[PDB]
Write a protein that binds this DNA or RNA. Structure first.
Ligand SMILES: Nc1ncnc2c1ncn2[C@@H]1O[C@H](COP(=O)(O)OP(=O)(O)O)[C@@H](O)[C@H]1O
Ligand SMILES: [Mg+2]
Ligand SMILES: [Zn+2]
Length: 623
RNA sequence: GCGCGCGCGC
RNA sequence: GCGCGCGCGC
């Protein structure tokens, strides 16, 4: 483990070396190579290299609290006995941050803290650090805190404000190629990433690949394009029942066709789900009793279509049978009883169609073949099966557990047993199964295999693209590691210079409750807090919201979130944002996303306050 | 509250 | 830019 002595593997000594030579280096190695151990050695070498009377200072960035706590503990245990001072700062920690940094040798930060401390000038300069280590360093792009930090660095390095600058090291399992759709674009993307981190070296394992390849998941991948049914006669009944039920809806809500942005919805697809969502979440109520009821049936049909597509009709029908038993046993409406009657007409035709052997799903025999072959070769195979939807998980399970040909299988659903069906995972650990099947899923011990099983050309094309994107990546790195370093440094510098040139480049309005459209406040009543937070003055506003005190509060920078504020109109109770304590003031704080803006009385819906270009008046203590 | 990143769809 | 969501930070 990470808390115990380790002999470094040969390839770890191999990856540590550029860093140990003082080079700004991106260390790129697959998950589970031991990136914590490499960074431990690098850090160890960095602080020991200093002559007596001199002292390094290391900062290590973690992007998340759990990772932050893991390394704070690993680094502490590891540098016991050297006598180094070791602490961390995170949101939970909040403190003389300048002095915490000054009086410690190893600091673990989430990076936003350092961004906050640079901007405010509490930490005047990155020059206090002699080494900076970025975990998951591929995040150094695009406004990520890691980039903000590096913009500070680069502004110094390029403004000749000197000031020695810390060595910079990054760790990642994959440098990425971004949007790249060719080698040149891939080379460009990776070069841009090295520019952003001032990296002149990319370290990969070369001399010890066989030693590495002895402990990194790399299954032989397999594309298996298959053919669908010749004719889903089950879909043709369900689709009519679906057309029939949209009709009934369009009765009780005319112009249904307009509520969503999602256009040309097709039955039995992911979109149709999204359309149902972008409609169950609209209206704006005794009519959305009838509507939610109609859309919740169009959902059960949509689901069933998907089960039929990748599993057997029986599996889809059963999910429809089980559903219509629950509705009748719950109680009968004249709308819940109609749909159910509507269904009951076709029931005899569906049950007939379901059991017709020529209606069987050919993709399932293909799944069976795969599972057979392997379990013949390696009978001790433990498998993991990823499927498209939650209903499919149960469908496939049911199908395995009822199939004479797969009796050697013992299935389990997740989030002993010999094959595992699911939609996602953690933990998990795919490398700990010898067989992974992706059964029509948009995704990604030695002798392990991965199979991709689909009748969709699209789905095969996604994996081909992902794979090519990975090849372009490694090819690009191999090319770049051949450059003389001075030539690379010179390419990097001008990417950095260009980047930096770019960085260097009132009437009153109503705010209404999005749900019930009640007048909430006017804009000349709004005040800004710091620059990013919106509060509404006056006592009149206090009556127009209620609040529910959040028993678990969070201490943020500007203030403390103590309560959630909900709409005051009882038939609504809409989420409006929060109520805070800000410098002895009990003030409310609102998200514009909760509200509707009005000028001829024209409604406009904003997501981010940064869009609304109204007159922003800042807070005044006394008013 | 705000900020950051990802994925899908127009 | 718009829609839906998912993860995470202060
Ligand atoms: N030289 C080594 N000696 C013994 N165990 C190691 C060595 N290198 C890595 N490991 C093991 O492999 C695991 C991989 O963890 P970590 O180093 O965090 O992987 P990652 O490369 O994904 O960061 C470590 O927790 C450790 O238990
Ligand atoms: Mg790591
Ligand atoms: Zn309301």
């Amino acid at each position: 483990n990470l808390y115990s002595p380790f002999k470094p593997r040969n390839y770890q000594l191999e990856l540590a070396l550029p860093a140990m030579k003082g080079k700004n280096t991106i260390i790129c190695a697959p998950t589970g190579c031991g990136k914590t151990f490499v960074s431990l050695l690098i850090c160890e070498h960095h602080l020991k290299k200093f002559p007596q009377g001199q002292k390094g200072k290391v900062v290590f960035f973690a992007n998340q609290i759990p990772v932050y706590e893991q390394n704070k503990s690993v680094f502490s245990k590891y540098f016991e006995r050297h006598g180094y001072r070791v602490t961390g700062i995170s949101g939970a920690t909040a403190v003389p941050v300048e002095q915490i940094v000054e009086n410690n040798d190893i600091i673990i930060l989430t990076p936003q803290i350092l961004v906050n401390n640079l901007k405010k000038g509490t930490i005047p300069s990155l020059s206090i650090f002699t080494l900076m280590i970025f975990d998951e360093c591929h995040n150094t792009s695009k406004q990520h805190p890691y980039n903000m930090i590096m913009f500070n660095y680069l502004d110094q390095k390029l403004g000749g404000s000197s000031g020695p600058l810390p060595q910079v090291i990054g760790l990642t399992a994959s440098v990425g190629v971004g949007d790249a759709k060719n080698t040149d674009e891939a080379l460009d993307y990776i070069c841009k990433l090295c520019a952003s981190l001032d990296a002149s070296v990319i370290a990969t394992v070369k001399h010890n690949l066989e030693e590495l390849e002895q402990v990194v998941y790399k299954p032989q991948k397999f594309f298996r394009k298959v053919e669908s049914r010749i004719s889903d006669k089950f879909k043709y009944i369900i689709a009519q029942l679906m057309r029939d039920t949209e009709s009934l809806a369009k009765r009780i809500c005319k112009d249904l066709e307009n509520l969503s942005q999602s256009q040309n919805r097709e039955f039995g697809t992911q979109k149709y789900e999204q359309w149902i969502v972008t409609v169950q979440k609209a209206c704006m109520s005794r009519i959305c009793k009838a509507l939610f009821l109609y859309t919740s049936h169009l959902r059960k049909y949509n689901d069933a279509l998907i089960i039929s597509e990748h599993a057997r009709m029986k599996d889809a029908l059963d999910y429809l049978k089980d559903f219509f038993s629950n509705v009748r046993a719950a109680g009968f409406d004249e709308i819940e009883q109609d749909l159910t009657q509507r269904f009951e007409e076709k029931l005899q035709e569906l049950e007939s169609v379901s059991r017709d052997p020529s209606n069987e799903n050919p993709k399932l025999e293909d799944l069976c073949f795969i599972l057979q072959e392997e379990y013949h070769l390696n009978p001790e195979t433990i498998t993991i099966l990823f499927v498209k939807t939650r209903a499919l998980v149960d469908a496939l399970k049911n199908w395995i557990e009822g199939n004479p040909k797969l009796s050697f299988l013992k299935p389990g659903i997740l989030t002993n047993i010999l094959i595992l069906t699911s939609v996602a995972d953690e933990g998990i650990d795919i490398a700990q199964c010898n067989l992974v099947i992706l059964y029509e899923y948009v995704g990604n011990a030695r002798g392990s295999k991965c199979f991709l099983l689909t009748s969709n050309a699209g789905v095969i094309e996604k994996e081909q693209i992902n794979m090519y994107k990975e090849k372009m990546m490694n090819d690009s790195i191999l090319r770049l590691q051949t450059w003389d370093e001075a030539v690379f440094r010179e390419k990097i510098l001008h990417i950095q210079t260009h980047e930096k040139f770019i960085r260097d480049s009132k009437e009153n309005k109503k705010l209404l409750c999005r749900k019930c459209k009640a007048l909430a406040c006017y804009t000349a009543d709004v005040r800004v807090i710091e620059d990013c937070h919106y509060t509404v003055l006056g006592d009149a506003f206090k009556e127009c919201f209620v609040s529910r005190p959040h028993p678990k509060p969070k201490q943020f920078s500007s203030f403390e979130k103590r309560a959630k504020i909900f709409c005051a109109r009882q038939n609504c109770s809409h989420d409006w944002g929060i109520h805070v304590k800000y410098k002895t003031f009990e003030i409310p704080v609102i998200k514009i996303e909760s509200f509707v803006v009005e000028d001829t009385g024209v409604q406009t819906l904003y997501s981010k306050w940064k869009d609304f270009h109204f007159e922003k008046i800042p807070f005044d203590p006394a008013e």
